[model samples]
Target: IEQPYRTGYHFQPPSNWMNDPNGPMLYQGVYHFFYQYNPYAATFGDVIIWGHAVSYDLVNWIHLDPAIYPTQEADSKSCWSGSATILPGNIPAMLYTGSDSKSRQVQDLAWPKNLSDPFLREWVKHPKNPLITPPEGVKDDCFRDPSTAWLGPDGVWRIVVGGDRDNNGMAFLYQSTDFVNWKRYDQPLSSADATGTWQCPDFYPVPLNSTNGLDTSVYGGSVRHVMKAGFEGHDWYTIGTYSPDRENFLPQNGLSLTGSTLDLRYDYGQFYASKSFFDDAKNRRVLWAWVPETDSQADDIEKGWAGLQSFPRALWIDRNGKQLIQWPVEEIEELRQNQVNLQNKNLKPGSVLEIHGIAASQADVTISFKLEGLKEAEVLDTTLVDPQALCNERGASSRGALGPFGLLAMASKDLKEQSAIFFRVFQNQLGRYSVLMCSDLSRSTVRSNIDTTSYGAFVDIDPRSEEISLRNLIDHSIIESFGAGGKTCITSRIYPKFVNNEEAHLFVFNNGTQNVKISEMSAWSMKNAKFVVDQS
Candidate 1:
């Protein structure tokens, strides 16, 4: 249970098979989080229950038995996925879609337990399934995964569901007053007008001021419509202007997009199935997304988990026309209890250092170095592996290299490896950086998708070495790093295998420093934990 990278106590679902969080809505102070899940399977297939969890603050979360489950009947093939919202009347209602065996789909509505009902009402699915089926003329039954939210101004409720039109991934809109009924609308909320078959359409207003600290216009908080676009490949966003009143949207319709475009990095093609809820208290939009870590279809189906969510990011647009300030929230700081700091020092470019501290698979921390006199040379971050070996001689390399771009090791001798992550920068592409993550297996490099610039297919990293500098902040399983000006950056949550005390060791080597500095290091004090929950 502790040998895989699923360790730690920071926010793992209480039990089996959770994916693509949905209906992340807060009602009457309780924040509800739901994700597509299959309770009975060890791998991905047959969407079953909407695994539920709730929290008042972002910190401590409580798992609730799934609020909605699937019906075994033929018409109730799968619960599919959807969103939760507290509508205008303060009613906690969820709008979701159901998939049939024909691979044809339909939308369904579910109402949570009525707290006021003395008898304890179980969640009730709307008697009539496919509450809002494709209109008479619409051309696609691949329709599923509805993301709905309340439009306060127009006193309307709009829903965007996954669909395909003429072979393109698309999302269509519907407006409703009562959760039971709906009216289909023509114009989609997405801008590239209509691109591919879009899935998991999420619409919410994000304030420009909350991002750049400058108020752009009165429509700042106006919701941004996001649709997961792409086929079986990369998922990207096409954010456009929205009308809360008319329940209408035109991508790039407002002053927010300026000349009509969202932050380019905000819609990285690889990171998909994104959902955001308005963190009204913070005046911010919090985004959660799944990062497809593997390319093999068999692995995805067999593992049951296709991806992991990126570290929660506070989304806001920056002045750089295409830059998005996707920073991790601060509550993660609670994971770091002890303190260690080394100020204004440069480690000789290529020397290794070992620092003493508690050794646990689950923890969060930050280590920084002020690199100077950095002549054009390669700077590397290497970690020791296979601590069980007495000689520390045969373990695979856990290294991350950053130059103009970033890349990590892809080949893994086993599933439990921390794996190498890298960033690469070249003389000709100093301002540009590439990112990659690979597992280290007997010196072999098995690569993950490193090409975000290419709609997230795959790109090769140049083997040449170049000077690189970095500042890294690790909170629990989360990695928030800043390169030169945070331009070419990497954000990842490293869930270490929860090996018993002393299962892992830390080692760092800098080829240049001949001087390696252990600037700051500390392990977290945590209640002992198991990575995977018991099934039998």
Candidate 2:
């Protein structure tokens, strides 16, 4: 039974527990991915170690043995998440959080023992381990997750570690020269009030207008910086500028410490503990995150595995430069072998069109809906700022004026169980229209005790001028949807018992009162990607 729930193409371990993808980087034409893993159980433990894999192409992977274990005194308790930096001579260095013998969180360094090895089989720890420790006055128990090092113009390398000070979540800045000795800044690079213990903090740069990406060290003109932190179960970020002279990150907007739901997030759903690295091979920044199990712990134990990684995404800044945009890496397209094309179909209210000839459980579907006007759209309550709460109130079944229309994934023949990825339109008192993208899992599984929490986010595209587009990558148990060309993303995990890998169905349905037109639609049957054990 668990075999049916195993993902077809997503990155996952063959067994046991995995979470928090760490230190993903490209080295000498080979992509190295390290992640938090517990090899012995489907649950987490202090013995958490690093599992390594290498891929020529991002889609197919070869799993190797544990890259870093709790061997040194710096990591006597466990090894946690971290980042990787490519040095001037093309050497790769990793800065990761190691739980020390006294259970103190500290940052340590490691480098490749043999750089010539494509798979990077072994790594050597620095003799002066625990390169950085918890800063004074910050809670030692909460400080961890060192960011990738960036070499400033002054020849001084800079980094930030997630920490906490008096209930305020902070990204503590640090500076170094020889890449070993580091000094904590008097103040944090950035912080938020009332948010506790920010985890997996990341700082990087993206071009303001160009789709191209910049290295983490490239910080001046025409580039804007992104400071992200994992808090309150979501990974959120703010787009701002950086000053190398003062090592200050000034967040302009999208990061609200007041705890508003409108804050920007990498994904509105289960994706968390994300990390990004510049892909010089492709001239873009690539992101990877963990998608966790939504089922009960007993189910995970029975299945012998727990987590799956969200597909690698190419990240860049949108034209507005207010937020970021992402799409699945081009490598995944190699798996789309069989195709279905639909064009110019009008969807009436209360109508459903079945998309056949493909395995719906494991497919990539790109569809767009054309809305003529917002005259029939429902009015959004001015006080209703939380997109998730609005979506929970009116999920797939509750009809609206303009939408509730998109793909129904992982469904049975009878449609009794399905997870919906759709959009709804709303107009405020000012007569401005907004689109709400939702992934509803209320009917995803008939099996009880599984979490079916629906997730949603407001996409930043004007429906009046553009065709509402959606692209969803549906694996057996995971669904990652990108709306309006990645301006808004939501990834969800659903375990559908009624529909197995072979029996799942896909449909384009509209439950809104108004008719929506399908300008163009395509769904592809995916071929399984490789995840083989390394022999060498």
Candidate 3:
């Protein structure tokens, strides 16, 4: 009954469709995760429920009973996405979107039935729920996805709800005096023009200079704010300074698709509806994104599952002071029991070296390339604006001067099906090196009528100063790659027709005109994670 494409370590339900992580929070040494689930089929059911799970470390988890169901008329249609906030006295509260029986979007509240239970399995809907409804001039369906609540200076709590107002993507601000009755502010917390309904909007605080995470209510300097939302099928975040009294978020860069390569997204591939929460135990803000499958519906139903959650990442602002940095949570290192290391391995032009002795289909790989002739790299075309289009135009096979040098993951024996996670260097208009990180899935599978779209983005790194590096978390079907120390990220899902523990192989190839060196490498075959019933 084991399938080749089933992921080994990534989180997925045994059967059904799951999407949009919701109400993730840490309470009393245990982590509670919630998501939109349809248990009856791999395809989405008529109504979705809030599924629950608990974890001690973010890596290992235990399933719990469904936390929130469509019992009352307020949420009789569906229980959609939302966030969690920790209140005073260490109490936990949930703010989620409810599709009422009339199919209107509403903001609802829920709390644990027993506070003493670490699992916090049973949830009681607040009697005053549908506390906040769609305000004037906003479409009812567009008003959903309530954000985590943060406190202002005068002891008033504030939250943002995703909405569409006059064709703009909006986050309507709501103020609460007692955490139940909320009043909508005239001015929105944030909005951008010409965009559709913003889904899964996230607002959180990060340290000014340190890598540590700040509580959502940290309302002043020495901290910055991140406003993230799902728009146009991608998750985008804007870094800015937030004012508590004014209730304004002044971003340095607005969230819009300007066709510029510097546009910031949580991932460059099929990832969306991300939610982040402060890990009080680790003193870091952790994020989990829903990664959708690229296979067809028939295949998804045949396999009995439809989605996978991206591995948890500890997120912080980068040293550049403009971008964010994400790294796989340190707890995932526990699965790395078997390891292989290499250093100073020269990669000549047209060289393909097999990285043996590890389960390539289910592994963790980190690699760095040392480029010698930087001056000879190809020049970036003046008209080339889209990174995804460029990656498709010049994929792994279309080699240039500097690279297409990285790892081949989830590959087959005869090299018929291989997903290339590689890099290519281009000299930009000003002669500085423009590093492009790409994941070419065109040859990833031999199956017919499946998505094999390639994805690429420019990594914010200097080749002369920093080594072009990558770290890939390869499951049987998906690859989560971080380039240049997580400055750029890409995640892709491919179903190889012929790949298993024994049939898969990892290789490092240099398909460039110039030579490079693999300065250091380490990979480990990841063990399957254990998911058990919650006994506590």
Candidate 4:
């Protein structure tokens, strides 16, 4: 399996393991993406090295040489997690965690120039380490996960580190106006009431529509809403007001909610330890997460490569609630090709049909199917990931809403059982698709003794079929789904399908209605697909 199969970005190598995007700083138009990297081999361990890259746009990334190396100097074993920032005007600075493994564990800071010559793009370490050490009472070993950001009000800096409390991992907030002399402050986010330890906690405001200004006002009478995408026990943040002076996370003036945990995107399976950042230019928040690709803890049965980042989605909250619209970022629209259209089609609920006339190796195609007089119907893709291999039922759910279905990558029943649904965007050696499903309860009978509710068979269409209706086809590295609304969307990556020339088709099924009607479908042949880095 090739390392960094995430597409449009070249990874370091195939030898070791990598996780988490770190040191994500942009300076002088160059963007940096660092991560938890083990250079020794393709396995997980603490021999952690920082993998670094530079990019002008989120697309078209350049793999800069290794940013930091591990050494035995000062009892230091490996460099841990951290974030990158510019003091002002792109002066690169990194606030990271390092483990000496011997002396008291402490946090440290390092600058690129402090340890190297002006010409060296390869990162060097500071002569001394542990720039920011932990407090005396807080044990060293359990402290990690450094999240750093520049606070506008203070003009100094602030950091939050993942720590263990009375045996729980919580995020502790600390502030420093000078980038040093940090003082422990309040706990804006806590995991003690939920999970044992909260590793990575990030706080930032989402601008719904800054074309003018975001509204932080209360609603009629007692109804109040602060628009922010938040999870309950696991995640919380309101786009509402924050009295930076009071050190408070107030939601709707104590009426909306202090904060709510982030609800799972898919109903089935586990999708945890996710991270997000903002693309300042677009004024949108993008997030990436890791999901175990297979049931096995170590390796996979299909091919190489593990885990994946969700297609860059426009993350925000609507008048209804928080929403995740998954689609390839807009910059990926650089690739498009010959057009084909299949319009005005009809299909029975239980049948699997493949629509032809749509062709592109790594391309984007739009498909819309409507079911009338129905409770629900499912659209699943088996060529993507093994949905039922982990268990059998695809834990697909409707969120009990008229819209928003979960991952259709594998069997709906399998996802339903695991409460974890994963979509395959760009597998190193496999297929990718937009996946969604249920969460909270296992749809599997084995795990929770739940009944095998047949959500009904979606289509597993024969590629050779000339029967189904297809709306439009184009070739691009990105696919943007017009979600339940123009605002909510589903973004997907077709790296292999785009440049690598992988074969892909579609399938549709009806769970409630016997027959369904598809209206007004069209295809396109445009140019400039940018998401596939290897292509350009």
Highest TM-score among the candidates is held by which one?
A: 2
Give the TM-score of each candidate.
0.70, 0.98, 0.97, 0.66
Pairs with backbone N, CA or C atoms under 3 Å apart (clashes), candidate 3: none
Cα lDDT of model 1 by residue, 413-495, tens digit: 24334322222222222433232222122222223422212211111222233233333443333333443333333444343
**Model 2 misplaced regions, further than 4 Å:** 254-259, 381-384, 500-502
Candidate of highest lDDT = 2
Pick by TM-score: 1 or 4, better one:
1
Report the lDDT tens digits of candidate 3 across residue range 167-209.
7887888999888999999998777777788888899888878
Error in Å for residue 521 of model 2: 0.5
lDDT of 4 by residue, 449-483 (tens): 22232221112222122122222112222222342
Per-residue lDDT, model 2, residue 364, is 97
What overall lDDT, based on C-alpha atoms, would model 1 receive against the true structure?
0.47
lDDT of 3: 0.87
State each model's CA lDDT, in order. Answer: 0.47, 0.90, 0.87, 0.42
Cα lDDT tens digits, model 2, 397-475, are 9988998999899998888889999999998878888899999998888999999999988998989899999999999
